[PDB]
């Protein structure tokens, strides 16, 4: 009988972490036009346009993310919709860390926020919050490997209060990626140092919930008063926020914590 | 030829957790005499006598603890000497939890401390500290299985600053028992709840270091002034403290933390 299991294939397939590196989206440009006054209406509209372009790349990434296709299609869609802000804000801190040593907020190569832009955007306190996350990346010396696994965990960090179509399939993928992170933090065996770091990384993931809650509060507010505020949103964000706003505001979004 | 492998033996061998249950020491009596006044000198001397009897059982337990025999003998002796206070204080909170719902400190069947004895012992604050751990066992609904594994982790929680004869053998055993706790807190699937409990238990373990440091400070103090204070110590404790006092006080005891 022909062996159905292929030792060669299992040994040859890239590790999950290696696949994450391979499928990570290339950098996206904001299309920022410096001729426009740096007022909140203009800066915020630009950030919304950038967000739409980033999400187009996020969905392509999710399509080839190992294990994600094992979840019901409706759950894949649900998870992207509930995690979008966490994913984009986390990636913003990563780009800021890698490209500016966490000195500025690197939204895109053509849109880098310094203190002035943060004030002008009318969301200064929120910019400071994401900047703080960037500063923690330097203190922790976060690695790309760690970052990629953590971004998947954020995709799996908020679920509908009633649950997904397949909680078991979700739980399997989540436990698998948590395992990857645990192995990632372990040569020189030192359980103590390994657990201390694992703890630092899960505390940071947990801290994303409060930050994301505040970012969404601002997002939903500007969306609701888009006309009065003159803040424009691209189709992709109208699609996402139109779905998310009522679900989050009615208390249906359940955060998953490590601590 | 005669098969050297025994399928039967493999199948019948109990799990490590079952072995921990099987080797748990039987309860020890203090030999408390209520006819004598409850002065600090009498109460502390009785607790020291109890401690000696308890350590005799701890050494018998360590001899049959799975994996411990794999470490160099020098390291087995060292770990027992560095962890004695953590093991005895943790076991005290366990008995208090199981026998009095954490209302009192159950040192032994014949010596249960209520607030009055805590004051009379002249170590009131320290008693409150161990009492708080007892109270945490109720809040967390600690199980006997969780307790036996955590007790082994405490045995492996303090090492010489220099280092053990075999850090690799030590690390292997510590990792194996951490793995046991990890699997023990798994539910039937819910990583969120499973990690939250693992976090609660490791934070509890970490909290034992500060409590133990304070208990040891009091112990070393009473030990060096035993004559003036009229506090007696049995041979077993004179042996343990004579070894530990200078090592701990010179900064050679390195606590291992999860957080
Ligand atoms: C300073 C920021 O842009 S923070 C945050 C994360 C982020 C990082 C990127 O790299 C890409 C762009 C995004 C997704 C922002 C898009 C604009 C968001 C949704 C903002 C939080 C609140 C705001 C302001 C306008 C509005 O209506 O809602 C998003
Ligand atoms: C209230 C306590 O006894 S707390 C602590 C843990 C403990 C729990 C037991 O179940 C058995 C007995 C032990 C090991 C105590 C023995 C007495 C100790 C070492 C005390 C902390 C300080 C003191 C007072 C006298 C002295 O010289 O040092 C030990």
UniProtKB/Swiss-Prot annotation, chain B:
<comment type="subunit">
    <text>Heteromultimeric cytoplasmic complex with HSP90, HSP70, and FKBP4, in the absence of ligand. After ligand binding, it translocates to the nucleus and binds to DNA as a homodimer and as a heterodimer with NR3C1. May interact with HSD11B2 in the absence of ligand. Binds the coactivators NCOA1, NCOA2, TIF1 and NRIP1.</text>
</comment>
<feature type="binding site">
    <location>
        <position position="222"/>
    </location>
    <ligand>
        <name>21-hydroxyprogesterone</name>
    </ligand>
</feature>
<protein>
    <recommendedName>
        <fullName>Mineralocorticoid receptor</fullName>
    </recommendedName>
</protein>
<feature type="binding site">
    <location>
        <position position="54"/>
    </location>
    <ligand>
        <name>21-hydroxyprogesterone</name>
    </ligand>
</feature>
<feature type="binding site">
    <location>
        <position position="48"/>
    </location>
    <ligand>
        <name>progesterone</name>
    </ligand>
</feature>
<feature type="binding site">
    <location>
        <position position="95"/>
    </location>
    <ligand>
        <name>progesterone</name>
    </ligand>
</feature>
<feature type="region of interest" description="Important for coactivator binding">
    <location>
        <begin position="60"/>
        <end position="63"/>
    </location>
</feature>
<feature type="binding site">
    <location>
        <position position="95"/>
    </location>
    <ligand>
        <name>aldosterone</name>
    </ligand>
</feature>
<feature type="binding site">
    <location>
        <position position="48"/>
    </location>
    <ligand>
        <name>21-hydroxyprogesterone</name>
    </ligand>
</feature>
<comment type="similarity">
    <text>Belongs to the nuclear hormone receptor family. NR3 subfamily.</text>
</comment>
<comment type="function">
    <text>Receptor for both mineralocorticoids (MC) such as aldosterone and glucocorticoids (GC) such as corticosterone or cortisol. Binds to mineralocorticoid response elements (MRE) and transactivates target genes. The effect of MC is to increase ion and water transport and thus raise extracellular fluid volume and blood pressure and lower potassium levels.</text>
</comment>
<feature type="domain" description="NR LBD">
    <location>
        <begin position="4"/>
        <end position="241"/>
    </location>
</feature>
<feature type="binding site">
    <location>
        <position position="48"/>
    </location>
    <ligand>
        <name>aldosterone</name>
    </ligand>
</feature>
<feature type="binding site">
    <location>
        <position position="222"/>
    </location>
    <ligand>
        <name>progesterone</name>
    </ligand>
</feature>
<feature type="binding site">
    <location>
        <position position="95"/>
    </location>
    <ligand>
        <name>21-hydroxyprogesterone</name>
    </ligand>
</feature>
<feature type="binding site">
    <location>
        <position position="222"/>
    </location>
    <ligand>
        <name>aldosterone</name>
    </ligand>
</feature>
<feature type="binding site">
    <location>
        <position position="54"/>
    </location>
    <ligand>
        <name>aldosterone</name>
    </ligand>
</feature>
<feature type="binding site">
    <location>
        <position position="54"/>
    </location>
    <ligand>
        <name>progesterone</name>
    </ligand>
</feature>
